[PDB]
Every structure is written in C-alpha cells, then in structure tokens.
Design a protein around this motif. Sequence first.
Motif, PDB file in Angstrom:
ATOM      1  N   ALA A  19       0.785  -1.234   0.000  1.00  0.00           N
ATOM      2  CA  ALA A  19       0.000   0.000   0.000  1.00  0.00           C
ATOM      3  C   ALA A  19       0.823   1.294   0.000  1.00  0.00           C
ATOM      4  O   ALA A  19       0.557   2.228  -0.763  1.00  0.00           O
ATOM      5  CB  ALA A  19      -0.960  -0.002   1.192  1.00  0.00           C
ATOM      6  N   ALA A  22       2.635   1.581  -3.414  1.00  0.00           N
ATOM      7  CA  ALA A  22       1.684   1.903  -4.468  1.00  0.00           C
ATOM      8  C   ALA A  22       1.387   3.397  -4.457  1.00  0.00           C
ATOM      9  O   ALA A  22       1.538   4.062  -5.464  1.00  0.00           O
ATOM     10  CB  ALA A  22       0.430   1.078  -4.313  1.00  0.00           C
ATOM     11  N   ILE A  23       1.078   3.928  -3.279  1.00  0.00           N
ATOM     12  CA  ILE A  23       0.814   5.345  -3.100  1.00  0.00           C
ATOM     13  C   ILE A  23       2.007   6.238  -3.369  1.00  0.00           C
ATOM     14  O   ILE A  23       1.871   7.297  -4.002  1.00  0.00           O
ATOM     15  CB  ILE A  23       0.232   5.593  -1.703  1.00  0.00           C
ATOM     16  N   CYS A  27      -0.038   5.717  -7.498  1.00  0.00           N
ATOM     17  CA  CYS A  27      -1.346   5.089  -7.633  1.00  0.00           C
ATOM     18  C   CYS A  27      -2.411   5.943  -6.932  1.00  0.00           C
ATOM     19  O   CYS A  27      -2.274   6.285  -5.747  1.00  0.00           O
ATOM     20  CB  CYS A  27      -1.349   3.702  -7.022  1.00  0.00           C
ATOM     21  N   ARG A  28      -3.457   6.279  -7.685  1.00  0.00           N
ATOM     22  CA  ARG A  28      -4.598   7.023  -7.168  1.00  0.00           C
ATOM     23  C   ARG A  28      -5.912   6.345  -7.464  1.00  0.00           C
ATOM     24  O   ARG A  28      -6.945   6.867  -7.141  1.00  0.00           O
ATOM     25  CB  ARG A  28      -4.583   8.449  -7.693  1.00  0.00           C
ATOM     26  N   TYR A  30      -7.794   2.458  -6.976  1.00  0.00           N
ATOM     27  CA  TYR A  30      -7.744   1.067  -6.516  1.00  0.00           C
ATOM     28  C   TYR A  30      -9.150   0.483  -6.566  1.00  0.00           C
ATOM     29  O   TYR A  30     -10.107   1.094  -6.075  1.00  0.00           O
ATOM     30  CB  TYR A  30      -7.175   0.986  -5.073  1.00  0.00           C
ATOM     31  N   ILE A  41      -4.804  -5.451   2.382  1.00  0.00           N
ATOM     32  CA  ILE A  41      -4.546  -4.303   1.500  1.00  0.00           C
ATOM     33  C   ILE A  41      -5.752  -3.419   1.230  1.00  0.00           C
ATOM     34  O   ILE A  41      -5.624  -2.202   1.144  1.00  0.00           O
ATOM     35  CB  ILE A  41      -3.839  -4.726   0.174  1.00  0.00           C
ATOM     36  N   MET A  45      -5.724   0.787   1.742  1.00  0.00           N
ATOM     37  CA  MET A  45      -6.077   1.659   0.598  1.00  0.00           C
ATOM     38  C   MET A  45      -7.362   2.458   0.871  1.00  0.00           C
ATOM     39  O   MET A  45      -7.412   3.668   0.602  1.00  0.00           O
ATOM     40  CB  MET A  45      -6.216   0.831  -0.693  1.00  0.00           C
ATOM     41  N   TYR A  48      -6.047   5.201   3.166  1.00  0.00           N
ATOM     42  CA  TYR A  48      -5.075   6.156   2.645  1.00  0.00           C
ATOM     43  C   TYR A  48      -5.538   6.941   1.415  1.00  0.00           C
ATOM     44  O   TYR A  48      -5.161   8.099   1.270  1.00  0.00           O
ATOM     45  CB  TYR A  48      -3.749   5.457   2.290  1.00  0.00           C
ATOM     46  N   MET A  49      -6.298   6.301   0.523  1.00  0.00           N
ATOM     47  CA  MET A  49      -6.666   6.928  -0.756  1.00  0.00           C
ATOM     48  C   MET A  49      -7.385   8.272  -0.599  1.00  0.00           C
ATOM     49  O   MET A  49      -6.974   9.238  -1.225  1.00  0.00           O
ATOM     50  CB  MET A  49      -7.509   5.983  -1.634  1.00  0.00           C
ATOM     51  N   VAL A  56     -10.912   4.575  -3.932  1.00  0.00           N
ATOM     52  CA  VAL A  56     -11.094   3.145  -3.765  1.00  0.00           C
ATOM     53  C   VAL A  56     -12.529   2.814  -4.175  1.00  0.00           C
ATOM     54  O   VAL A  56     -13.473   3.374  -3.641  1.00  0.00           O
ATOM     55  CB  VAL A  56     -10.849   2.698  -2.304  1.00  0.00           C
TER      56      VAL A  56
END
Length: 169
Positions: A19, A22-23, A27-28, A30, A41, A45, A48-49, A56
């Motif tokens: 995670a 990815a961030i 990555c924006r 998921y 995971i 996400m 955090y997203m 997400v």
Amino acid sequence: RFPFPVGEPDFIQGDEAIARAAILAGCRFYAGYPITPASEIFEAMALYMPLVDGVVIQMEDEIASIAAAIGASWAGAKAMTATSGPGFSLMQENIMTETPVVIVDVQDHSLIVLSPSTVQEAFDFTIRAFNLSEKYRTPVILLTDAEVGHMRERVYIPNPDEIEIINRK
C-alpha cells in the motif's frame, strides 16, 4: 503530504508495504473487495486513498474490479486491483491493447510477474511493478501470499524525492 510516515524506518507488514509503495509510486485508483484474512490491503487503501485525493472502488466481482482499473487507466490514472485464489484466473481474459495496470494476486503466459518473499521486497517490487507497467504500457502482476502479507519487518520508507518513478509515454 502523505498519510503515513515517510523518509524513515517503520516496522510494518507486507500488505502495508504494498500500500505505501503503491501510493508513493503515484497510484490514485484502486478497485477491489476485502480479501482478509489472506490480505489486509483493501483496508489500508480505503484509509489512505481519500487522504491523497485517490479513489477506492469496492466491487465484489473480480471481473468488475479489473475492468474498472482498466477504464481508470485509459482515463489517465495509475491503477491497481487485488485478487485472491481463484479470482485471478477469472481476470485472465481482461488482463493487447497496452494498458498500464498493477494486479496484486494473493496466493503458460507472457506476463511480467514479480513475486516478493520479504516485506522489503513487497515494498521494492511494488514500486518496480508500477515502473514496469508504465515503461512497457502493460499489465504487471505482483504475486504474493498471506505469509508475506503478514510478515513484519523494519524497512526504510523513502522520501518521494529518493524514489525513481517512471510515467507512461
């Protein structure tokens, strides 16, 4: 800027390393469903997203989650999805076309596949997987398991400026 500590070590599990990587890699988007206990995971996400202006999307069907990550990617996002056990094979046909996407699979082809065995590798291989999917405009598979996902190790989480990110041409 980031919702987790960066530029220092932290004692974290394999899923959390995925995670964070990815961030940090940009990555924006998921798409997935919970695959706990096999993976944590989704929840990382989901937390955090929103904090980095990312998305997400929750979708039970594996076919839907991958199709959604594909559409987001064509629309210009760095996208990923996560599946477990049988779910990966259901995605097989969607996975030509040249769409950059990272697919985390928990537990005959010519796909690029990275298989981390430690928490450090979960981190580094996740960054490498985004870099490869962008470089070659193609799906990259991060193949993991529940063992790696729940291992705990102290790893240096770099500052953004310390990480080489490749973006699609």
